[PDB]
Design a protein around this motif. Structure first.
Motif, mmCIF file in Angstrom:
data_model
loop_
_atom_site.group_PDB
_atom_site.id
_atom_site.type_symbol
_atom_site.label_atom_id
_atom_site.label_comp_id
_atom_site.label_asym_id
_atom_site.label_seq_id
_atom_site.Cartn_x
_atom_site.Cartn_y
_atom_site.Cartn_z
ATOM 1 N N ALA A 108 0.766 -1.250 0.000
ATOM 2 C CA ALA A 108 0.000 0.000 0.000
ATOM 3 C C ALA A 108 0.784 1.281 0.000
ATOM 4 C CB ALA A 108 -0.891 -0.004 1.205
ATOM 5 N N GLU A 109 0.342 2.240 -0.808
ATOM 6 C CA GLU A 109 0.992 3.531 -0.863
ATOM 7 C C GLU A 109 0.600 4.362 0.363
ATOM 8 O OE1 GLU A 109 -2.624 5.010 -1.180
ATOM 9 O OE2 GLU A 109 -2.093 3.593 -2.764
ATOM 10 N N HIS A 110 -0.676 4.345 0.757
ATOM 11 C CA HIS A 110 -1.109 5.174 1.894
ATOM 12 C C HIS A 110 -1.038 4.395 3.185
ATOM 13 C CE1 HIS A 110 -2.082 8.714 -0.218
ATOM 14 N NE2 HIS A 110 -3.397 8.738 -0.108
ATOM 15 N N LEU A 111 -0.221 4.893 4.105
ATOM 16 C CA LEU A 111 0.015 4.245 5.380
ATOM 17 C C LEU A 111 -1.279 4.057 6.161
ATOM 18 C CD1 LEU A 111 2.636 3.237 6.659
ATOM 19 C CD2 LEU A 111 2.767 5.369 7.936
ATOM 20 N N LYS A 112 -2.178 5.033 6.059
ATOM 21 C CA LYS A 112 -3.418 4.975 6.815
ATOM 22 C C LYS A 112 -4.203 3.764 6.414
ATOM 23 C CE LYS A 112 -6.829 6.545 4.855
ATOM 24 N NZ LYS A 112 -6.607 5.225 4.213
ATOM 25 N N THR A 113 -4.119 3.421 5.138
ATOM 26 C CA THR A 113 -4.868 2.300 4.611
ATOM 27 C C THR A 113 -4.294 1.062 5.227
ATOM 28 O OG1 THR A 113 -5.153 3.546 2.616
ATOM 29 C CG2 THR A 113 -5.522 1.155 2.462
ATOM 30 N N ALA A 114 -2.971 1.024 5.282
ATOM 31 C CA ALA A 114 -2.274 -0.122 5.829
ATOM 32 C C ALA A 114 -2.653 -0.380 7.266
ATOM 33 C CB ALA A 114 -0.784 0.097 5.764
ATOM 34 N N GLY B 39 -14.413 8.257 -3.869
ATOM 35 C CA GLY B 39 -14.615 6.827 -3.793
ATOM 36 C C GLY B 39 -13.537 6.306 -2.873
ATOM 37 N N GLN B 40 -12.346 6.909 -2.950
ATOM 38 C CA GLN B 40 -11.221 6.470 -2.127
ATOM 39 C C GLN B 40 -11.600 6.696 -0.686
ATOM 40 O OE1 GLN B 40 -11.128 8.481 -4.976
ATOM 41 N NE2 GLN B 40 -8.994 9.156 -5.099
ATOM 42 N N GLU B 41 -12.253 7.829 -0.448
ATOM 43 C CA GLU B 41 -12.676 8.166 0.886
ATOM 44 C C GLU B 41 -13.724 7.143 1.312
ATOM 45 O OE1 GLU B 41 -10.272 9.659 0.320
ATOM 46 O OE2 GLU B 41 -10.532 11.838 0.202
ATOM 47 N N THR B 69 -14.067 2.519 -9.085
ATOM 48 C CA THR B 69 -13.422 1.232 -8.930
ATOM 49 C C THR B 69 -12.836 0.970 -7.552
ATOM 50 O OG1 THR B 69 -11.549 2.329 -9.924
ATOM 51 C CG2 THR B 69 -12.749 0.782 -11.341
ATOM 52 N N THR B 70 -12.039 1.911 -7.051
ATOM 53 C CA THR B 70 -11.306 1.692 -5.815
ATOM 54 C C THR B 70 -12.155 1.079 -4.738
ATOM 55 O OG1 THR B 70 -9.693 2.718 -4.307
ATOM 56 C CG2 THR B 70 -11.686 3.961 -4.781
ATOM 57 N N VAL B 71 -13.400 1.521 -4.664
ATOM 58 C CA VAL B 71 -14.281 1.042 -3.630
ATOM 59 C C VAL B 71 -14.498 -0.448 -3.824
ATOM 60 C CG1 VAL B 71 -16.685 1.163 -2.830
ATOM 61 C CG2 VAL B 71 -15.405 3.266 -3.254
ATOM 62 N N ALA B 73 -12.735 -2.563 -5.402
ATOM 63 C CA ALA B 73 -11.499 -3.300 -5.238
ATOM 64 C C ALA B 73 -11.331 -3.707 -3.806
ATOM 65 C CB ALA B 73 -10.349 -2.450 -5.681
ATOM 66 N N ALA B 74 -11.634 -2.772 -2.930
ATOM 67 C CA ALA B 74 -11.502 -3.021 -1.525
ATOM 68 C C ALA B 74 -12.465 -4.125 -1.164
ATOM 69 C CB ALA B 74 -11.827 -1.772 -0.766
ATOM 70 N N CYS B 75 -13.676 -4.053 -1.721
ATOM 71 C CA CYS B 75 -14.711 -5.017 -1.384
ATOM 72 C C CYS B 75 -14.145 -6.364 -1.685
ATOM 73 C CB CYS B 75 -15.969 -4.806 -2.219
ATOM 74 S SG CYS B 75 -17.513 -5.234 -1.391
ATOM 75 N N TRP B 76 -13.368 -6.439 -2.764
ATOM 76 C CA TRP B 76 -12.721 -7.677 -3.169
ATOM 77 C C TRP B 76 -11.548 -8.033 -2.255
ATOM 78 C CZ3 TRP B 76 -16.953 -8.378 -4.709
ATOM 79 C CH2 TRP B 76 -17.629 -7.541 -5.614
ATOM 80 N N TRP B 77 -10.834 -7.059 -1.678
ATOM 81 C CA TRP B 77 -9.760 -7.446 -0.775
ATOM 82 C C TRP B 77 -10.449 -7.974 0.464
ATOM 83 C CZ3 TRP B 77 -8.133 -5.885 4.191
ATOM 84 C CH2 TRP B 77 -6.952 -6.505 4.612
ATOM 85 N N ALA B 78 -11.646 -7.455 0.711
ATOM 86 C CA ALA B 78 -12.494 -7.875 1.817
ATOM 87 C C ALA B 78 -13.183 -9.197 1.508
ATOM 88 C CB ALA B 78 -13.560 -6.838 2.049
HETATM 89 C C1 LIG Z 1 -5.071 5.192 -3.010
HETATM 90 C C2 LIG Z 1 -5.626 3.996 -3.471
HETATM 91 N N1 LIG Z 1 -5.841 3.948 -4.794
HETATM 92 C C3 LIG Z 1 -6.365 2.893 -5.416
HETATM 93 C C4 LIG Z 1 -6.550 2.931 -6.804
HETATM 94 C C5 LIG Z 1 -7.104 1.842 -7.481
HETATM 95 C C6 LIG Z 1 -7.464 0.720 -6.741
HETATM 96 C C7 LIG Z 1 -7.267 0.693 -5.363
HETATM 97 C C8 LIG Z 1 -6.714 1.766 -4.655
HETATM 98 C C9 LIG Z 1 -6.493 1.745 -3.274
HETATM 99 C C10 LIG Z 1 -6.865 0.627 -2.521
HETATM 100 C C11 LIG Z 1 -8.224 0.425 -2.209
HETATM 101 C C12 LIG Z 1 -8.633 -0.649 -1.420
HETATM 102 C C13 LIG Z 1 -7.727 -1.538 -0.871
HETATM 103 C C14 LIG Z 1 -6.373 -1.437 -1.209
HETATM 104 C C15 LIG Z 1 -5.992 -0.346 -2.013
HETATM 105 C C16 LIG Z 1 -5.431 -2.333 -0.709
HETATM 106 C C17 LIG Z 1 -6.022 -3.615 -0.125
HETATM 107 C C18 LIG Z 1 -7.267 -3.310 0.695
HETATM 108 O O1 LIG Z 1 -8.191 -2.586 -0.133
HETATM 109 C C19 LIG Z 1 -5.951 2.884 -2.666
HETATM 110 C C20 LIG Z 1 -5.750 2.910 -1.290
HETATM 111 O O2 LIG Z 1 -6.133 4.143 -0.647
HETATM 112 C C21 LIG Z 1 -7.483 4.351 -0.213
HETATM 113 C C22 LIG Z 1 -7.941 3.309 0.816
HETATM 114 C C23 LIG Z 1 -7.569 5.742 0.431
HETATM 115 C C24 LIG Z 1 -8.426 4.330 -1.421
HETATM 116 C C25 LIG Z 1 -4.280 2.664 -0.885
HETATM 117 O O3 LIG Z 1 -3.852 3.199 0.158
HETATM 118 O O4 LIG Z 1 -3.602 1.908 -1.613
#
Ligand SMILES: Cc1nc2ccccc2c(-c2ccc3c(c2)CCCO3)c1[C@H](OC(C)(C)C)C(=O)O
Ligand SMILES: Cc1nc2ccccc2c(-c2ccc3c(c2)CCCO3)c1[C@H](OC(C)(C)C)C(=O)O
Lengths: 214, 216
Positions: A108-114, B39-41, B69-71, B73-78
């Motif tokens: 992960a790029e964003h630490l908060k996410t991590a 969406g990231q938020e 998408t990002t949202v 994607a997370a759902c999928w990591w979940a």
């Molecule tokens: C910035 C950012 N950009 C993206 C662009 C495209 C696709 C995904 C992301 C993800 C992301 C989202 C969910 C998630 C993971 C990463 C990694 C695995 C768990 O699920 C993030 C993340 O940042 C946010 C959470 C603020 C969106 C990140 O820090 O990497």
């Protein structure tokens, strides 16, 4: 006894500091990254934290957020009372979380996410063979046990309070009031604190009404 | 199937929009006001949500963040999955309800966003007269609790299903069919012909694990 007691650990981080929360028994953590560390920032997190799980009190390692007027003010809104090798290991559990954030840092790029992810890791985390014992089960079962404990204790309190008076058979004297184990129309079971006995309902006497504390 | 699903709504107030994350059956709600809506938020709160409780899924007919998408994607990591009409209508009413609640909290509170977090704590912590449950937040731990027990037990059925046992009946007569053991009583067997529910002596019946090369 054990419930409602949580422990919060400060995080000194690259970039922004963050604060993590765990019922020591639950094992759950709801840690947030702090845009800026302030006694006043801390509170809003505490406000959210309280909703998801009631915590009677939290011991604090650091005086400065507690010294902050803001912090205390929230503890009174909630009813949460600030309280004055195991935690050094819990700090190592948080270190493990840091290592977790590290194992995911590359990811992960964003630490908060991590960090949140790391939280998702401690959560729902089996140990070796799963053997149930879910980290995710946390004290959630302990919550249920407590909820039940509340109900049982309630029916319990009405009984503990009550007094039922029985007379020994063929004895003019009637035995002093004791808590009753069972009630039947044909018969009743009761326990003297000293001894436990069962007697006929016709032999049985009971006192129905008392009311106080609104 | 229902406990896993949760429902999320965000309604703008004074321009700024809060993100709201209810568990439908419990009705327990966690909402995060977002400094900015993206969406990231959206996802970060989602991430948090998954950590606090597992959510099998959530539904929006259209989401702008959902389209983002990002949202997903997370759902999928979940492993959570993005997607009773009358309750869904009630949900929009619930979104509104909290605002009304909030109106009372504002005369009370200094900052509205801080006020909103309190409003939710109140809603969750609030009994509702205790009618749905002594606490609506209480209803959640229970539902979760029931499931936990359910899963282990469900698994009990999975382990149990595997066992294969036959019934002597009288020794001279052959035994017509395979049996699935309902329960084991020592010196005895509790089995069920799908057709009939029965029980018999241990000696009569020998039990063979169906499995071959199980991981156990
Ligand atoms: C910035 C950012 N950009 C993206 C662009 C495209 C696709 C995904 C992301 C993800 C992301 C989202 C969910 C998630 C993971 C990463 C990694 C695995 C768990 O699920 C993030 C993340 O940042 C946010 C959470 C603020 C969106 C990140 O820090 O990497
Ligand atoms: C800015 C601010 N300054 C303070 C200075 C001294 C003492 C308390 C505060 C509080 C505060 C703290 C706890 C709390 C409530 C309010 C209100 C009831 C719940 O508990 C806030 C609040 O701001 C934060 C929440 C960010 C701390 C606010 O006014 O919204």
């Amino acid at each position: 006894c054990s419930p409602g007691i949580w422990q919060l650990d400060c995080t000194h981080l690259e970039g922004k500091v963050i604060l993590v929360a765990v019922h020591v028994a639950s094992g759950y953590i709801e840690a947030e990254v702090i845009p800026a560390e302030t006694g006043q920032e801390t509170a809003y997190f505490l406000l959210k934290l309280a909703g998801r799980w009631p915590v009677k009190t939290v011991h604090t390692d650091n005086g400065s957020n507690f010294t902050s007027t803001t912090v205390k003010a929230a503890c009174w809104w909630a009813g949460i009372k600030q309280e004055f090798q195991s935690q050094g290991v819990i700090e190592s559990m948080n270190k493990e979380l840091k290592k977790i954030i590290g194992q995911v840092r590359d990811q992960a790029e964003h630490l908060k996410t991590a960090v949140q992810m790391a939280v998702f890791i401690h959560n729902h985390k089996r140990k070796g063979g799963i053997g149930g014992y879910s980290a995710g089960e946390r004290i959630v079962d302990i919550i249920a046990t407590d909820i039940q404990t509340k109900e049982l204790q309630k029916q319990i309190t009405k009984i503990q309070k009550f007094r039922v008076y029985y007379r020994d058979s063929r004895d003019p004297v009637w035995k002093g009031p004791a808590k009753l184990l069972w009630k039947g129309e044909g018969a009743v079971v009761i326990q003297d604190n000293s001894d436990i006995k069962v007697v006929p309902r016709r032999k049985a006497k009971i006192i129905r009404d008392y009311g106080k504390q609104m």
